[PDB]
Design an enzyme around this catalytic site. Structure first.
Site, PDB file in Angstrom:
ATOM      1  N   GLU A   1      -8.114  -8.698   0.479  1.00 12.77           N
ATOM      2  CA  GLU A   1      -7.654  -9.434   1.673  1.00 12.77           C
ATOM      3  C   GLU A   1      -8.327 -10.453   2.136  1.00 12.77           C
ATOM      4  O   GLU A   1      -7.452 -11.531   2.428  1.00 12.77           O
ATOM      5  CB  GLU A   1      -7.647  -8.471   2.616  1.00 12.77           C
TER       6      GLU A   1
ATOM      7  N   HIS B   1      -1.080  -9.765   9.905  1.00 15.62           N
ATOM      8  CA  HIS B   1      -1.876  -8.622  10.046  1.00 15.62           C
ATOM      9  C   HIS B   1      -1.541  -8.130  11.832  1.00 15.62           C
ATOM     10  O   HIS B   1      -1.690  -8.927  12.623  1.00 15.62           O
ATOM     11  CB  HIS B   1      -3.243  -8.805  10.048  1.00 15.62           C
TER      12      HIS B   1
ATOM     13  N   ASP C   1       1.031  -1.136   0.248  1.00 12.80           N
ATOM     14  CA  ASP C   1       0.086  -0.027  -0.010  1.00 12.80           C
ATOM     15  C   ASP C   1       0.847   1.236   0.117  1.00 12.80           C
ATOM     16  O   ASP C   1       2.073   1.152   0.617  1.00 12.80           O
ATOM     17  CB  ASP C   1      -0.730  -0.167   1.405  1.00 12.80           C
ATOM     18  N   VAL C   2       0.336   2.333  -0.628  1.00 13.69           N
ATOM     19  CA  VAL C   2       1.356   3.494  -0.314  1.00 13.69           C
ATOM     20  C   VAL C   2       1.047   4.497   0.574  1.00 13.69           C
ATOM     21  O   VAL C   2       2.124   5.192   0.957  1.00 13.69           O
ATOM     22  CB  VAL C   2       0.840   4.283  -1.971  1.00 13.69           C
TER      23      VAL C   2
HETATM   24  C1  LIG Z   1      -8.581  -7.602  16.308  1.00 15.17           C
HETATM   25  C2  LIG Z   1      -9.162  -6.152  15.629  1.00 15.17           C
HETATM   26  O1  LIG Z   1     -10.292  -5.733  15.547  1.00 15.17           O
HETATM   27  N1  LIG Z   1      -8.134  -5.588  14.972  1.00 15.17           N
HETATM   28  C3  LIG Z   1      -8.422  -4.215  14.322  1.00 15.17           C
HETATM   29  C4  LIG Z   1      -7.774  -4.121  12.878  1.00 15.17           C
HETATM   30  O2  LIG Z   1      -8.611  -5.185  12.238  1.00 15.17           O
HETATM   31  C5  LIG Z   1      -7.921  -2.864  12.234  1.00 15.17           C
HETATM   32  O3  LIG Z   1      -7.473  -2.939  10.882  1.00 15.17           O
HETATM   33  C6  LIG Z   1      -8.301  -3.302   9.805  1.00 15.17           C
HETATM   34  O4  LIG Z   1      -8.374  -4.767   9.976  1.00 15.17           O
HETATM   35  C7  LIG Z   1      -9.510  -5.101   9.017  1.00 15.17           C
HETATM   36  C8  LIG Z   1      -9.732  -6.699   8.931  1.00 15.17           C
HETATM   37  O5  LIG Z   1     -10.326  -6.875  10.290  1.00 15.17           O
HETATM   38  C9  LIG Z   1      -8.839  -4.697   7.358  1.00 15.17           C
HETATM   39  O6  LIG Z   1      -7.484  -5.431   7.316  1.00 15.17           O
HETATM   40  C10 LIG Z   1      -8.762  -3.335   7.307  1.00 15.17           C
HETATM   41  O7  LIG Z   1      -7.870  -2.848   6.111  1.00 15.17           O
HETATM   42  C11 LIG Z   1      -7.715  -2.772   8.568  1.00 15.17           C
HETATM   43  O8  LIG Z   1      -7.604  -1.412   8.506  1.00 15.17           O
HETATM   44  C12 LIG Z   1      -7.301  -1.823  13.277  1.00 15.17           C
HETATM   45  C13 LIG Z   1      -7.666  -0.422  12.528  1.00 15.17           C
HETATM   46  O9  LIG Z   1      -8.753  -0.289  12.325  1.00 15.17           O
HETATM   47  O10 LIG Z   1      -7.907  -1.747  14.548  1.00 15.17           O
HETATM   48  C14 LIG Z   1      -7.741  -3.146  15.120  1.00 15.17           C
HETATM   49  O11 LIG Z   1      -6.369  -3.290  15.209  1.00 15.17           O
HETATM   50 CL    CL Z   2      -0.842  -4.297  -3.369  1.00 15.49          CL
END
Ligand SMILES: CC(=O)N[C@@H]1[C@@H](O)[C@H](O[C@@H]2O[C@H](CO)[C@H](O)[C@H](O)[C@H]2O)[C@@H](CO)O[C@@H]1O
Ligand code: CL
Ligand code: HG
Ligand code: HG
Ligand code: HG
Ligand code: HG
Length: 263
Positions: free
Chosen positions: A221, A151, A129-130
């Site tokens: 994703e 993640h 991602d940028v």
């Molecule tokens: C355990 C939890 O709820 N963690 C959340 C993160 O999920 C969240 O980041 C997002 O995650 C979703 C998938 O669940 C997507 O990947 C999305 O693109 C992410 O931004 C972060 C930020 O909102 O907050 C917690 O860490």
């Molecule tokens: Cl990408």
């Protein structure tokens, strides 16, 4: 054909001394999980340089996101694959808006306005991602046929808590009793061949979902996770490789914060 490494002087690895006692450094399918302290970058740099490795870094910058390019590229110049050949691929709807960033020798950038070309120009593809910035070393230790990144919000969570697509109607569906890790859609890569296979599979799966009138909970994703569940990555990157210090701080388990979200 891999030529011989030259004489090298470094600390002897200790068979009876675990690398890290606080984290898992290898998956059940024997793929290394990359954490600081698990690798000797000098040995790895030698191995990849002797192969004249070229790494392609791709980013999509549409509309407002073009504003993130300067910091992204500038920091990549300081931390991404320094010493190796790098080819940046910036896909954007605003070609003239791409900033003029000074690049080190052996590094080039191509602006593509919005794939066999990749096969002849680079050995590996890294897709990110940028709206991010490099803050520490991100090097050849990540290169392998296929890799995914843990993640930052789920690395310590149980699979039941993973935000996989849970509807059987979707091609990205993963039941509660399946799943190894929750990978990020914002940082994956591997050989050009493997990356194209992944994107090709994702594209087709998303078309099937669309035709079936359904959209995976976390879009691309979600499909990435389904793909990596059925096609195990040959390396998995720790959260050091994609973190958000504003939202998650800097826990002890992370000796380095290499690539992070921009506040
Ligand atoms: C355990 C939890 O709820 N963690 C959340 C993160 O999920 C969240 O980041 C997002 O995650 C979703 C998938 O669940 C997507 O990947 C999305 O693109 C992410 O931004 C972060 C930020 O909102 O907050 C917690 O860490
Ligand atoms: Cl990408
Ligand atoms: Hg170690
Ligand atoms: Hg890519
Ligand atoms: Hg896709
Ligand atoms: Hg995908």
């Amino acid at each position: 054909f891999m030529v011989s490494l030259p004489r090298m002087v470094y600390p002897q690895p200790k068979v009876l001394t675990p690398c890290r006692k606080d984290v898992l450094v290898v998956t059940p399918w024997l793929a290394p999980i990359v954490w600081e302290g698990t690798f000797n970058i000098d040995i790895l740099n030698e191995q990849f340089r002797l192969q004249n490795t070229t790494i392609g870094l791709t980013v999509f910058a549409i509309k407002k996101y073009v504003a993130f390019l300067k910091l992204f590229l500038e920091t990549a110049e300081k931390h991404f694959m320094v010493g190796h050949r790098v080819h940046y691929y910036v896909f954007t709807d605003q070609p003239a808006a791409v900033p003029r960033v000074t690049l080190g020798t052996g590094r080039q950038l191509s602006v593509l306005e919005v794939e066999r070309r990749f096969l002849s120009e680079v050995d590996y593809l890294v897709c990110v991602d940028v709206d991010m910035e490099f803050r520490d070393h991100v090097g050849v230790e990540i290169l392998t046929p296929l890799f995914g990144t843990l993640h930052p919000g789920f690395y310590g969570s149980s699979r039941e808590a993973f935000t996989y697509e849970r509807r059987p109607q979707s091609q990205a569906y993963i039941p509660k009793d399946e799943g190894d890790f929750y990978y990020l859609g914002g940082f994956f890569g591997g050989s050009v061949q493997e990356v194209q296979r992944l994107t090709r599979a994702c594209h087709q799966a998303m078309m099937v979902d669309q035709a079936n009138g359904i959209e995976a909970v976390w879009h691309d994703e979600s499909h990435l996770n389904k793909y990596l569940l059925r096609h195990k990555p040959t390396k998995v990157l720790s959260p050091e490789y994609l973190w958000d210090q504003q939202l998650l701080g800097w826990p002890a388990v992370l000796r380095k914060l290499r690539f992070t979200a921009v506040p």
